[PDB]
Amino acid sequence: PPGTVDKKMVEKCWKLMDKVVRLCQNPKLALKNSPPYILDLLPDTYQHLRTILSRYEGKMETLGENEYFRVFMENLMKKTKQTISLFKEGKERMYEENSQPRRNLTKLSLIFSHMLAELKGIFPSGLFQGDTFRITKADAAEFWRKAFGEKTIVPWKSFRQALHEVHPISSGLEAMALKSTIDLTCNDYISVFEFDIFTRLFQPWSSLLRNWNSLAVTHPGYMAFLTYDEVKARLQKFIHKPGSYIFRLSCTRLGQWAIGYVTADGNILQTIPHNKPLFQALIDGFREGFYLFPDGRNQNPDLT
């Protein structure tokens, strides 16, 4: 149950984040510009927290006591100290493009991206609206509203208990894997924003956890978070095998899928299901002949 936020706290966050920026400006890093890109994400977060503070000028005790914002600010300071402690321990490994400590910086940078996207979804124009956040899928929005009313945020354990009474979770290992998918901000809470993303991606509600198992646990087509330029470079090694395809999450477009595939004429196209569940777009695209070989493999999962 985290501490009341005040200006000292937000001022100290700005000093931590400044440090992270100075660390990531080292030209030995050769840090790429692609999403997620921590040298944009930090100052965009700073801009949107100034925008929040400005809206609450009269009313800092109402802001500082908001539970979502207290959880968020505690997590922003934690994740900032983690990135600083990662430079300090990783040292010369930080300059090795694909060492462990560098792949960890990419993970953090992702979490900063998710954090900022959640903050803007809860405080659009710097005003709190978590209690009126619009859940996109109607069955998911009934489930939240009944179990949690207008809550913006819930501890993982209550979320998992509430979810289990409607979509049974079959082991503790399944449950930790589910946590790590849904808890994008890695703070052991489930926001209503994070719940909207996950139920959008793994719709329809009625076989939620079965869609999640077969699209994102077991499917050779699944890439988790990638950039469009990283999809093209992966499928390019299969430019010669029409019907090769993968599907990815996008850190600039939370809650949507993008399908990359190799056409008959040796190009690579991308499609965004806007229309159907991914599950159905994969079934249709296999029977239309476009989505045959997931990560270029011969055998395609049966989803029907």
User: Which residues define the annotated binding site for 4-O-phospho-L-tyrosine?
Assistant: 248
Under rule CB under 8 A, how many of the chain's residues touch a second copy? 45
**Residue 42 interacts with a second copy (CB under 8 A): yes or no:** yes
| Number of neighbours of residue 296 by Cβ within 10 angstroms | 18
66 binding Ca ion? (CB under 5 A):
no
If contact means CB under 5 to 8 A according to the sort of partner, which of Ca ion, a second copy, none does residue 22 touch? a second copy
The one segment of 46-54, 78-86, 131-139, 283-291 that binds a second copy by CB under 8 A: 46-54
Crossing angle, helix 38-55 and helix 100-122, to 10 degrees? Answer: 30
Dist. CA 248–CA 246, nearest whole Å: 7
Minimum CB separation of residue 264 from a second copy in Å reads: 15
Nearest alpha-carbon partner for 202 in 259, 278, 112:
278
26 or 142: CB nearest a second copy: 26
173 sits near a second copy (criterion: CB under 8 A): yes
Q: Does 299 bind a second copy (CB under 8 A)?
A: yes
How many other CB atoms are found less than 10 A from the CB of residue 275? 9
CB-based contacts of 139, cutoff 8 Å, min separation 6: 204, 205, 206
CA distance 122 to 114: 12
- What CA–CA distances, in Å, run from 271 to 62, 170, 180, 259, 284? 44, 33, 26, 5, 13
Residue 183 contact among Ca ion, a second copy, none, beta carbon within 5 to 8 Å by kind? Ca ion
Tell me the C-alpha distance between 106 and 275, whole Å: 31
**Residue among 57 and 288 whose Cβ is closer to a second copy:** 57
Q: Which stretch binds a second copy (CB under 8 A): 76-84, 114-122, 123-131, 196-204?
A: 123-131
Does residue 183 interact with Ca ion by CB under 5 A? Answer: yes
Q: Which long-range contacts (CB under 8 A, 24 or more apart) does 7-13 make?
A: 7/53, 7/60, 9/73, 9/77, 10/49, 10/53, 10/73, 12/77, 13/49, 13/73, 13/76, 13/77, 13/80
Which residues sit in the known binding site? 183, 185, 187, 189, 194, 248
Which one among 22, 78, 88, 145 touches a second copy, defined by CB under 8 A? 22
The yes or no reply on residue 185 touching Ca ion (CB under 5 A) is yes
For residue 48, give the 3-state DSSP assignment.
helix
Out of 61, 131, 150, 229, the residue judged to bind a second copy by CB under 8 A: 229
**Residue 217 binds which of a second copy, Ca ion, none (CB < 5-8 A, kind-dependent):** a second copy
Choose the binding region for Ca ion from 124-132, 143-151, 185-193, 243-251 (rule: CB under 5 A).
185-193
Tokens of 19: 């440090």
Interface residues for a second copy in 186-225 (CB under 8 A)?
213-214, 217-218, 220
Q: Give the single-character DSSP code of 244.
A: E
When asked if residue 127 is in the footprint of a second copy (CB under 8 A), the reply is: yes
Token pair in block for residue 158: 């209550």
- Alpha-carbon distance of 58 to 181, in angstroms, equals 38
Binding stretches for Ca ion (CB under 5 A): 183, 185, 187, 189
Binding stretches for a second copy (CB under 8 A): 11, 14-15, 17-18, 21-22, 42-43, 46-47, 50-51, 54-55, 57, 89, 92-93, 100, 125-127, 170-174, 176-177, 180, 213-214, 217-218, 220, 228-229, 252, 267, 269, 297, 299, 301-302
